[model samples]
Target: RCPEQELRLQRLERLPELARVLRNVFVSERKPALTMEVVCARMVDSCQTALSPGEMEKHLVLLAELLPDWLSLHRIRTDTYVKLDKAVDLAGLTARLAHHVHAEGL
Candidate 1:
């Protein structure tokens, strides 16, 4: 489902605009120890020198992949941070991503 939406969004004409909004929304709510730029860069680096022609599309794909999960993850992180005054660690972020990816593609 995430990959399906990822490829679909990459086809839109004003796709850049949608990415801008997602980034804004990501930062507007609160500051993250890491940002979408960081995640996208990770995507690019991971797939670099591979068979993919549109390397930068990985950034767009990552954005789309996170859009639906953003709010849900944000809710939990926000509440947890408020209660514990402890932000989600970088490993926790990666762990959640790993969890949903479920090692299926690995």
Candidate 2:
């Protein structure tokens, strides 16, 4: 969540002071830690060279819908992986979303 506009403007002006005041802003969430680098590599491998920036953004949006469900689905599907070469489409998806968030400041 973001702050109100007036307060945000004041904070923007006092950014250096704010940074010092709130040095450690985040308390890391109790979420599973997955490797972004590996995901990015997978995304790069999954992507075609013909993808334009806009097309890539569209791809990101599509996965945004699938990812939440896939996280749960993938774990359940693990037992069935031996028969499937692709364990989950989300293998590339999580990577792409992570890549987008990292690169686009999402």
Candidate 3:
């Protein structure tokens, strides 16, 4: 379903407070987008008295469903775990060859 329809359906569920909080989150933060983790922390710090833990979690989940595009996931690259050179099994070699290949068959 579209975002506007989803928002309207959520509003009909007697969760207007959650919608308000969702709006507040976007308005209070200057950043364009934030992750659920960050928004959860912000909700705790800023709206502590207004929401309980369970209520906050529930509201956040619903808000995320309503505004899926607003949440962002960042990917980090690492140079670790480089693949070793192909094994070279030969006679009089210092090391033993222990080749292990896991290939999927058709």
Candidate 4:
């Protein structure tokens, strides 16, 4: 199994990536609203403590860059069949994101 801390960081990194990939691959073929940066910042803010409202926007951008790696993890693994897959995906991403946000021991 992967180290919990490492896994968490990976997941945080994955959230935006997954959102963008899923939006394009599954939800919106024509166009995907789930940009990596938007969702990643969403992932980060989901855990970040001191983020000002404006800083939130910058976080979103950082998350976007991490999306490609995130998408790769999920995309290369399985087909989407879960009930509420999008929500589930986001949930997984949140925990992973939170893991990174709180990470210090590792």
Give the C-alpha lDDT of model 2. Answer: 0.33
Better-scoring candidate (TM-score), 1 or 4? 4
Model 3 TM-score is 0.39
Stretches of candidate 3 exceeding 4 Å from the true structure: 1-14, 48-55, 66-106
Each prediction's number of clashing residue pairs: 0, 0, 0, 3
Clashes by residue pair, model 3: none
Q: Scored by CA lDDT, what does every candidate get? A: 0.40, 0.33, 0.43, 0.43
Q: How high is the lDDT of residue 56 in model 1?
A: 43
Q: What is the number of residue pairs that collide in model 3?
A: 0
Off by over 4 Å in 2: 1-48, 69-106
Of 1 and 4, which scores higher on lDDT? 4
How well does model 3 score by local distance difference test?
0.43
What TM-score number comes out for model 2?
Answer: 0.23
The model with the greater TM-score, 2 or 3, is 3
lDDT of 4 at 68: 30
RMSD value for candidate 3: 21.6
